[PDB]
Design a binder for this molecule. Sequence first.
Ligand SMILES: CCCCCCCCCCCCC/C=C/[C@@H](O)[C@@H](N)COP(=O)(O)O
Ligand SMILES: *[C@@H]1O[C@H](CO)[C@@H](O)[C@H](O)[C@H]1NC(C)=O
Lengths: 338, 56, 223, 292
Amino acid sequence: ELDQLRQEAEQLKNQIRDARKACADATLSQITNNIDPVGRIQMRTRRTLRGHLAKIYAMHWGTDSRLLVSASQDGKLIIWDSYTTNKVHAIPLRSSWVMTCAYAPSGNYVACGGLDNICSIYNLKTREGNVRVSRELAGHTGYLSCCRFLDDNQIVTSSGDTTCALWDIETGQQTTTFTGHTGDVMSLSLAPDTRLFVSGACDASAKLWDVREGMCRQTFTGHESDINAICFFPNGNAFATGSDDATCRLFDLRADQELMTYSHDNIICGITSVSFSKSGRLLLAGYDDFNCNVWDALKADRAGVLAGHDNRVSCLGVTDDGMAVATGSWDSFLKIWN
Amino acid sequence: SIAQARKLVEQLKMEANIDRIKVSKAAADLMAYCEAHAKEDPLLTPVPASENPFRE
Amino acid sequence: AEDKAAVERSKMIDRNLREDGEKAAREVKLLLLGAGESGKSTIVKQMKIITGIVETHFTFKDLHFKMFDVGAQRSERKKWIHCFEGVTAIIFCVALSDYDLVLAEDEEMNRMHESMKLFDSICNNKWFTDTSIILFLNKKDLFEEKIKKSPLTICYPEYAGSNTYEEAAAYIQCQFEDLNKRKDTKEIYTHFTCATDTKNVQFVFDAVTDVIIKNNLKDCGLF
Amino acid sequence: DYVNYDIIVRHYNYTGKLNISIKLTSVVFILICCFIILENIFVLLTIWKTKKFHRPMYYFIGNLALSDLLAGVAYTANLLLSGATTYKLTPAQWFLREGSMFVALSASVFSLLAIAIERYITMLKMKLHNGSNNFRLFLLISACWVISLILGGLPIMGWNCISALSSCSTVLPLYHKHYILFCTTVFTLLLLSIVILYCRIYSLVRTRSRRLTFRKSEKSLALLKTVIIVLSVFIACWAPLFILLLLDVGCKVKTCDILFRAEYFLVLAVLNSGTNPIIYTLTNKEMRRAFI
Ligand SMILES: CCCCCCCCCCCCC/C=C/[C@@H](O)[C@@H](N)COP(=O)(O)O
Ligand SMILES: *[C@@H]1O[C@H](CO)[C@@H](O)[C@H](O)[C@H]1NC(C)=O
């Protein structure tokens, strides 16, 4: 009976709820009550990258902590050199409607995508030639929301068709498909080990996926709207989610339960980006109110503001060495902060 | 319908039987990790101006 | 030694970027929207004589147009609609012959009402407050023939008027234009399309010219 | 010479204005000038406090506002330092006092011309987006202020009635009648320029609109109303003083009595300087919202 097999699901929901509350021994705010606070984090604009003539929708750092790539709606993918500020490359995308950007760990390839439902991979180290398109991955039914390399041959992508996919750049075929989300997947984040990854969707939940097996290990709820951004904690045992309900939440994998909520009454707009600092003690979150707030991950108190943009901060990233923060916005500028 | 309900209940039963940990232990672990790496975070500890590539 | 070459290459890239930008700033941008079985394909086919998102370029009377059709996006629209903030106009297509047809719901959902709901959502959207809408009412001959057999009361039960083509057509136009709450910032240009018109490109051209004049007067402060 | 207290007395005696502290009408005019000053301060405060207003067109509007502010300040000073203070002044101080007024009013008129030129260029091009062509924005404002300074400070560096006493103006006894003729000609050219420019703007809009075919004017009538308001409020408020100066160049000393009551025409011109912000901020429909 369909009626009987629907009733059962509520029983397992109740069982999970109870098995989780049984683990609620003390809130993170208590175990972390006596640690000294961080103090005000004052950061200033070191650089200002100019050259985009439209909104900037994504950015990603390279593993070298010096080169970053940015994607704008003017149909340009620009590879900068943040130190000297000079444009190393400018790639004329075929589809101007890009909303994703990635930089391979090896520094050889860059990926992008968007409303074209395709993930384009451009090769940067081609013998005595200009940057040419290396590959085009086309198996998604919705727009491409996020993509991240695993190595020079594998890439994970999230789409608005409520599905994620692990690809094979050599053959261009979907190696694995991750299903289970009920809404559009808006962001994804790889773990340091590259064995698991979490995804946040518009169904107001996040899911942890196993890359090699393809199953959903755990599901996390609590947000009251779409989850726009998701980032991993440096040690790989927790993550953070920013939503349209003007709130961030910290989840722990081996607890299966929300730990902390970063919110404030004066903040009512949505969150567009979240990232951690190299130590994981700071949580930088970009907002639609044109600002980027620096939360203290272990406590709740806010500890900084990065106000430098005339339009909303759409993308936010931190270098692998933790030396600088990059912030893009709809005003067509990028800023580096120290 | 029926297959979708079966898939949902199977996923929920797979998510139920998981070895969980008390939130106190997880909080202690996060605190320990952040405390061990506090000296390697330029954003946390502004580095000397001579060693910062973006000021030089 | 290698820094000078780097700055040279960066200056060259900036030059190319400026050229490309000032060339792209001379193109009209149109966002094509409509219900399922509207005359989208007909409109794009008759305007081209001059798996994602389809882009159609064309030139008419020394003016270049880029029209973007995004009907193949079954995802939630509120997550990517803002990508089109700044287009020159929105071309919205509505099928008149849908006034007597039901949707896949097949219980109480009238297809014309679904199209009307979509138009109401798009017109009053927070991103499109100053952007004008070119409305194309398609299937006008099929409507003309159908409105002789089944009265228009099947849609808009609060309707009382002649059962002839001109009256009902004007009535539906007014209904679609009464949904415009932002009646002070944007306009709604309407035009009854057929399978064979030969003059829809002209209408889009004139509407865009009017929008350009209005934007210029707003730039000077003269309006 | 330029340090003789007797030159001013001799000229005022010759033109029939010799009279031997703040009178009935001075206070009301002073408060009107203060009102003008604060009005134009508001326009600059709002133009500079809003990121959307950082295009070249609000720079021209702000330039006009600055000119109107300077005109108000100059008129306050000229009204305080006139009257019984005229005989406590040196001819150099007298020349500075009058040149301040000439420079401020000329600057305001040239700012109106600059706004008209920018509007005419924007409509004629009729491009999809208007870029900030900064070269024109700095090459017009500089021309306005430079021409104003050269024209207003010309009598002090010669070209005055000191040597030849017959060529005196009744309204400004130490000025040359030919200088007043020169300034009136410049004003006439600027007025014709502004009228022609706005008429061509209206003609362009109407002609381009009439070629469009729609199913269901109103936008081209509002343009006519705004153009009519602008040109009427300019000509009406500047025509009395222009006619006064022409009459003042026309007749010989002591013949024309009306010339002695010239402080009404001047206050009307400064009233135009004060009315400009109302017209260039009421008909915008976007500065109204930014005000609050
Ligand atoms: C574009 C060119 C525009 C040209 C501008 C024309 C300027 C016209 C200003 C003419 C009047 C200047 C100020 C003179 C005022 C006198 O009436 C009193 N100061 C005399 O007062 P007394 O000392 O006798 O009491
Ligand atoms: C003014 O000039 C007239 C005619 O030259 C002269 O008779 C009269 O005495 C003069 N008055 C003064 C104060 O100089």
